[PDB]
Structure 1
Amino acid sequence: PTIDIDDLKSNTEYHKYQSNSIQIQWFWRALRSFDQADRAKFLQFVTGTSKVPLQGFAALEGMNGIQKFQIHRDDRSTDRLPSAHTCFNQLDLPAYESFEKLRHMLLLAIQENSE
């Protein structure tokens, strides 16, 4: 319910994406449009928990210490769903063809729960 998305964006690492990559702009644009409940669902999808550190996302953890959120480029298929590695706060994002497809697959990924 308190997600300064500029703070998460300023503390996000990339590989092999760049900060100005089109799928990254679509990613932050789509994450901005989510409810606080959906942003919490994304935080749980990527990190396993929806809690936000008191010092912001710069102090994000992390199995053995501070591990910033990181988006990686999935070079396997544009028709596969996003995936996360939790242990390393990493989101696998394929090079989707449109913003609508990225937002749709992202919502479909984070709104699968109970497991």
Structure 2
Amino acid sequence: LISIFTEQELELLISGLPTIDIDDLKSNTEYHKYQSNSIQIQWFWRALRSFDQADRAKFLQFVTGTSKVPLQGFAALEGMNGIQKFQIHRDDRSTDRLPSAHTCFNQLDLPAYESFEKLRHMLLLAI
């Protein structure tokens, strides 16, 4: 009966769905090879705004490894080596592979997916 939940959903069942201040995450995002006005990044923020609270939580788990919201805000987001901001990296491999996450750095590697729809499908399939 518990096996109906995913490894995400059991956490969301025990501790509940968080309310994600997408503005706080955006305020605490670092862009390395993308830029803040890249079209794939505007698609990323549009997608993440379009995801419901549960798919947002699954994204947060995908990139940070947890759904827990920091009391002080995502400025206080910890990583392996102290406070690590969330971060989006362009994955220069082929764009027929999913984004990939390294949660101890809170690191997203993101291929330069050609479209909003395809990027959204791949992200939703990852989470």
Name the TM tier (shorter chain): over 0.9
Deviation per CA, 1:19-41: give whole Å up to 9, x if none: 00111100010000111111111
Q: Secondary structure at the match of 1:13?
A: strand
Q: CA offset at residue 64 of structure 1? A: 3.0
CA RMSD across the alignment: 0.8
Equivalent pairs: percent with the same residue?
Answer: 100
Aligned length: 110
Q: Secondary structure at the match of 2:95?
A: coil
Q: CA offset at residue 92 of structure 1? A: 0.9
Aligned to 1:50: 67
Q: Which runs of 5+ in 1 are unaligned?
A: 111-115
Q: Secondary structure at the match of 1:70?
A: strand
Structure 1 or 2: larger helix share?
A: 2
- Runs of 4+ in structure 1 off by over 2 angstroms are none
TM-score (norm 2): 0.84
Deviation per CA, 1:24-72: give whole Å up to 9, x if none: 1000100001111111111111111110101111110112311000000
Q: Secondary structure at the match of 1:55?
A: coil
Deviation per CA, 1:1-20: give whole Å up to 9, x if none: 31111110111001111000
**CA distance in structure 1 between the partners assigned to 2:100 and 2:57 by the alignment:** 16
Q: CA offset at residue 75 of structure 1? A: 0.5
Q: Which runs of 5+ in 2 are unaligned?
A: 1-17
Query: Equivalent of 2:36, from 12, 15, 19?
Result: 19
TM-score (norm 1): 0.92
Q: Secondary structure at the match of 2:62?
A: helix
**CA distance in structure 1 between the partners assigned to 2:42 and 2:126 by the alignment:** 19
Give the greater-gyration-radius structure (CA): 2
**CA distance in structure 2 between the partners assigned to 1:62 and 1:50 by the alignment:** 14
